[PDB]
Design a protein around this ligand. Structure first.
Ligand SMILES: Nc1ncnc2c1ncn2[C@@H]1O[C@H](COP(=O)(O)OP(=O)(O)OP(=O)(O)O)[C@@H](O)[C@H]1O
Ligand SMILES: Nc1ncnc2c1ncn2[C@@H]1O[C@H](COP(=O)(O)OP(=O)(O)O)[C@@H](O)[C@H]1O
Ligand SMILES: [Mg+2]
Ligand SMILES: [Mg+2]
Lengths: 55, 458, 85, 85, 460
């Protein structure tokens, strides 16, 4: 019984780590949309202050 | 006696003789073909030039038109004769009924009441809505603001507040339509007339199709009527359909007035324009205005300068969010940002205060768990962290409620929940006396009873 | 009535507005960009029979007209929280 | 002395500066906004007893005076990076 | 006679017109009577015919249009040399300590060219601070520049005060302190500290405080540097302490906007790199004498990445970056070993003994930072035995980098410690090789010496 429960642990950790790896990759694809939107907005705002800063 | 000398968009410049130049905010008048156009003076430039905003369509103006100087501000019909009728920004009647039989007219530009004249009240106003007068209760004679992005329930919530407050309010009511869909205004007018409550409501509309000068000044026309009913000594309700449009119509004009842009391209005078309106919509020792204001937030960005400066002017702030509306939970109120000046142990009593802080403490702790739940899922939580998550999800669903104005959408019958009944429900969930019902039992139920009954139906 | 891309109209108005040096706002559109799409779409309406009678000098009685509008907006990466959307 | 929202004071000074058409800076604040707050907060001091005797022309001897300041600033979403904070 | 008139006043920027024959040169100085008070102006630009644009070296309040202005035909010149020791002066070199006139014999101009390429010197004489992390990770020469980089409230002023105690007392020579945009409270605290230490008679102080007008805050650094150049040209070895270089650049930004310069990135002036370079290049050691320099630099928001911190990094030989993370975690000094370094950390000079010890520490602490994130996911349960030794060594090394300062006994109650270079090498190599994990983690913390670290573990 002990040795079967140890093999059941390893198979349960395997499927848990699969789900964790997929949920991590799915969070990368959301943080990169937040980052790129903040990148573009920071360029637009700084260049508006520069162009509106002259004259 | 004066001539048009430049025409930029909605802004018109007029030249007058040096002895005859208009005061600021005086109203001018022009023949625009077969139409009459009113211009409001904004600035005096050098040399008898005066710069003005057109209160109507700017198309079809030539240079060199004769302008007539009416030597007074924009003045609007006021008082008991203004009641049950629809008006322009200029106070003209816009329903097909006849003349407004007004005895008095007031200028729409006024000073706020003196600091000596203000008055304070702790009297709770009760509402049908579980989350609002649990988390952000508000008082007779105070200001309420509904914040949200596009399409999240700002209007539906204000229309429920109109229904529920008018149950216990006897006096007159004013509705300022600033920059919202006309179709809404027509639906509301027919709702008011088909229920015969129209006899007590005064409506001012300057809807989003109208050019910038209308949208800027129509907010002030609405206040000027409510200030009359207040100075008659009554107590009054003022509902404002979207106050953001006032500051945006100021942005659309500002650059044409020749002003350097500020911050995210806003007018430099933004904080003064907002204050000079908001400070006259107040209660006083002679009478009281209770007001609900919708506040659109652009691009869901709660940190934009226009939302950010509006937060300081309000007593109760309710913050809607798209992420909760997307989960089906209506009203999509965020309990972790909605707040009130009135949520004090002394004002509401300890049991209410303690229940509200308990709900916030649990829901915040559930937010702290979402990152580990996202990466690893729930099985790696602690054995009482699983209990917090189970109570927090039940609390989230029990904040949801059926509305009588949402039967056109849900089809479900609506519910009114008394204060005593909601705090008892939330206290009981937090003590765990309901910890054996499923989550779905709490969705869209008026009172806890209805949740145990719904759990019997699964 | 179908408008096949109101996002492409806003870009064209942004081009003309910036060539006239008008100070830009959020995402570089002018503040007039709300007023642009507002005055367009707010004409798609249904009107009561008294308006149709008064407009047509009584030649049509008791009918009610309507204009139904389906504007299209294209949005980047599904972001429903960008400005023009 | 407690200054409630020095952040509001700065926005009032920005309005004045842009209406006077002075050259704008970061977040469109005037460049000399640091000097606005700097010359206000540096008035909060403890002064030695020889300054108090020299000022009061000897009427008060051997006591130090003090002025303590507690300015309040508001940060939008906590960002210490903004120009006034 | 006075030959020009004021034609505009817009904040700190005063425009003055002169006849077309006698227009003042750039950086010349002008004098006007503002009410009862004499005001100095400094010429920034010649623009159009006969007009010049100037900055007020004092309050602009009360100036009228049409006031007469006199052209002093020279730059601002300040008293230098032995008569400045023990005295506090402003940007104009007037006495603000109320002890009377300076009584100088010579006055020099605050604007001058840098030393020629031919005149520079190279020498690598190791100075010693007695501060573990600095002497390990960022050892100083003589004649080099030391940057202390940090945001608000991280220990720049405490570290500069401890460095003043350790270096100056042993220096046996003159020193200059420049307060650029410094808090008046801290300037009084330092002055009283120097007189109570009875060292004030070897130090000259120049103060331009935060409340002063932008012109004062801009030019004070050049005044203090001009005094240090006088002592250098006499052939001496001197310390120059500059209490924040950032507010020199920032005073230039406020000025630049109304000078009518077109803005640059992040709102900075176009000239930022030029203005910094014209200051830093004067601060060197030549064949005739040596200036040793310690500079604090404010990094806005801890960004470290905006132009003013970025430009200043190039000029310095020793760089100590103080981190909000370590300061917030409560370990002092807050010096980040992964971003701090000196060009004297060369195997040849420091000898292999010191170099291999330092690089060993640096390599462990980087390995710890990689493990530290996934440790939150894995705990230490799923980490390996190779990791468990490394983390144990890393944490105890990172405790042994802390030290109590004689300055900071006010904050801490514990006495200040001093630690010699050989001893701190012996202690870090002792955990590197001896690996005395016998001892609790707090036994390495705030103790100072290796012997006191074991004795603390012997006590607990
Ligand atoms: N309590 C509710 N129950 C069911 N559906 C709702 C509820 N509240 C809002 N909705 C749905 O979301 C829509 C958006 O809310 P509402 O009609 O108030 O527009 P809004 O959020 O005010 O946007 P706008 O500011 O443009 O008017 C509702 O029309 C309805 O479609
Ligand atoms: N070695 C130290 N010991 C104790 N406290 C310190 C030490 N270094 C810095 N601090 C703390 O930092 C703050 C002062 O740092 P300071 O250098 O004056 O700020 P800044 O670096 O912004 O000038 C105080 O909280 C002080 O207690
Ligand atoms: Mg709405
Ligand atoms: Mg300091």
């Amino acid at each position: 019984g002990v040795v079967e429960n140890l093999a059941s642990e390893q198979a349960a950790r395997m499927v848990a780590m699969k789900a964790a790896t997929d949920n991590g990759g799915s969070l990368i694809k959301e943080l990169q949309l937040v980052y790129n939107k903040a990148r573009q907005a920071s360029i637009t705002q700084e260049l508006t202050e520069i162009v509106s800063g002259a004259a | 006696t004066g001539k048009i000398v430049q025409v930029i968009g909605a802004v018109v410049d007029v030249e007058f003789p040096q002895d005859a130049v208009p005061r600021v905010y005086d109203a001018l008048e022009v023949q625009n073909g077969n139409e009459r156009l009113v211009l409001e003076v904004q600035q005096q430039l050098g040399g008898g030039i005066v710069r003005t905003i057109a209160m109507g369509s700017s198309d079809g103006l030539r240079r060199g038109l004769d302008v007539k100087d009416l030597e007074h501000p924009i003045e609007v019909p006021v008082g008991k004769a203004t009641l049950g009728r629809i008006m322009n920004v200029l106070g003209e009647p816009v329903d097909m009924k006849g003349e407004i039989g007004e005895e008095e007219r007031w200028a729409i530009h006024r000073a706020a009441p003196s600091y000596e004249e203000l008055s304070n009240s702790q009297e709770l106003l009760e509402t049908g809505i579980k989350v609002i007068d649990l988390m952000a209760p508000f008082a007779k004679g105070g200001k309420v603001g509904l914040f949200g992005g596009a399409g999240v329930g700002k209007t539906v919530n204000m229309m429920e507040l109109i229904r529920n407050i008018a149950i216990e309010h006897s006096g007159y009511s004013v509705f300022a339509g600033v920059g919202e869909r006309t179709r809404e205004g027509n639906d509301f007018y027919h709702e008011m007339t088909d229920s015969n409550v129209i006899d007590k409501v005064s409506l001012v509309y300057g809807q989003m199709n109208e050019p910038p000068g209308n949208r800027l000044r129509v907010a002030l026309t609405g206040l000027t009527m409510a200030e009359k009913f207040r100075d008659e000594g009554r107590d009054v309700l003022l509902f404002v359909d979207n106050i953001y449009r006032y500051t945006l119509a100021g942005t659309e004009v500002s650059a044409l007035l020749g002003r350097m842009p500020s911050a995210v391209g806003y007018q430099p005078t933004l904080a003064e324009e907002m204050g000079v309106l908001q400070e006259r919509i107040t209660s006083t020792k002679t009478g009281s205005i209770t007001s609900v204001q919708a506040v659109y937030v652009p691009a869901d960005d709660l940190t934009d300068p226009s939302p950010a400066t509006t937060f300081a002017h309000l007593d109760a702030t309710v913050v809607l969010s798209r992420q909760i509306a997307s989960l089906g939970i209506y009203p999509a109120v965020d309990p972790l940002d909605s707040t009130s000046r009135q949520l004090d142990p002394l004002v509401v009593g300890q049991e209410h205060y303690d229940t509200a802080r308990g709900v916030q403490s649990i829901l915040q702790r559930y937010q702290e768990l979402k990152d580990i739940i996202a990466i690893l899922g729930m099985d790696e939580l602690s054995e009482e962290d699983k209990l917090v998550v189970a109570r927090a999800r039940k609390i989230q669903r029990f904040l949801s409620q059926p509305f009588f104005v949402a039967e056109v959408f849900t089809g479900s019958p609506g519910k009114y929940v008394s204060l005593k009944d909601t705090i008892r429900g939330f206290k009981g969930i937090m003590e765990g006396e309901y910890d054996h019902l499923p989550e779905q039992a709490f969705y869209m139920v008026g009172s806890i009873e209805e949740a145990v009954e719904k759990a019997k139906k699964l | 009535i179908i408008y096949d891309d109101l996002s492409k109209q806003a870009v064209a108005y942004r081009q003309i507005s910036l060539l006239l040096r008008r100070p830009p706002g959020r995402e570089a559109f002018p503040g007039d960009v709300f007023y642009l799409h507002s005055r367009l779409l707010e004409r798609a309406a249904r009107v009561n029979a008294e308006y149709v009678e008064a407009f047509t000098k009584g030649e049509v009685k008791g009918k009610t007209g309507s204009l139904t509008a389906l504007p299209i907006i294209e949005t980047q990466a599904g972001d429903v929280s960008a400005f023009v959307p």
